[PDB]
Write a protein that binds this ligand. Sequence first.
Ligand SMILES: *C(=O)[C@H](CO)[C@H](O)CCCC[C@@H](C)C/C(C)=C/C(C)=C/C(=O)O
Length: 387
Amino acid sequence: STGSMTIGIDKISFFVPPYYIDMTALAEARNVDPGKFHIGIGQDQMAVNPISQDIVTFAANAAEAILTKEDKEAIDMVIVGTESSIDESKAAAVVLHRLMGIQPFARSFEIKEACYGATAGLQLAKNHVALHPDKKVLVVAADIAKYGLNSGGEPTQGAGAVAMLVSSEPRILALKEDNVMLTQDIYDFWRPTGHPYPMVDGPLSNETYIQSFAQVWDEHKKRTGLDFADYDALAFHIPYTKMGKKALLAKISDQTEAEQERILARYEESIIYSRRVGNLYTGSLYLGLISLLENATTLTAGNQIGLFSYGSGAVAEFFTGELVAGYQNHLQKETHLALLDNRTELSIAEYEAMFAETLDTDIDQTLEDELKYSISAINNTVRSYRN
Ligand SMILES: *C(=O)[C@H](CO)[C@H](O)CCCC[C@@H](C)C/C(C)=C/C(C)=C/C(=O)O
């Protein structure tokens, strides 16, 4: 049968701060071969932000790129998935709801589970719309991935947000009901209260990440009978581009030469933008989706897209979407390329200073920044934004 209600991603966009540092410049400052960052790790430009830009700034900018008048009237749920919260009680989603001018009778909250938070939001939104097909949900991934100067994870760093509008009859990606979820209690990466930077066991994280994909994939294959041949492309959450390729490589070892090339070529398309941005944590998978859709030229209506989401801790999920005819007319390629091209290239000195600076919310202060939705002042610990 056809004619059934479809539910999924109607519009999607990302935002990153107007600054970056080139990995060659970093490599040289770190006394390391630039090839080690550019190729070994697989990153080219690291998105960096000043203290006048937080998850609200990025979420607001990303969402503003896709929301229209009618969307703002139909949205009754606003969700932010993040692991970079600025408050322990008040959800960042509440401020986003105001800044976006969304209609008042909506619920807003924050979801936390490492880089999986936005995925939890996406699937829950899907179910919400299934029961309420006239309504829409704003789901935004927002994060600031900082490991530390001279840390192993430094070259993988990034910052920004990915906003998605979930609705019935979505114009881009129709989501399936083939979800396979997994939870394991593992301390590969975490951030205890009071830690500005994360605790991380790189080895354990990479091992758990790779095995988590294998595990949900095998279960999915067992439930559905679908194999890699049945997927036109796969989008992955990734800690960094090379590790993503390694998780994929590990699982397609038994595929024919031609299918490996096809699948790997798709992966390369999915990491175009990540190479110029770095890790968005919760937004990494969905940046990969945008990148795939905007850089691929042979993808078409009806194609099946597999999505692997991961959260340290650890949680994982594999689910499927189908490209909706006409989707190529509802992307934001021009805007994204302009967004990436109009950034300032920071010197190592400028980078390390911006990175080190900290916002002390206990001190009332004023902050100057041209970016819309940036922090304009702190008063009694309360952040004011431009609007
Ligand atoms: C998301 O779930 C999670 C953040 O919570 C993220 O995907 C992974 C975080 C940890 C990833 C590390 C493996 C990054 C890193 C330290 C790698 C390198 C290059 C360092 C090294 O010492 O080799």
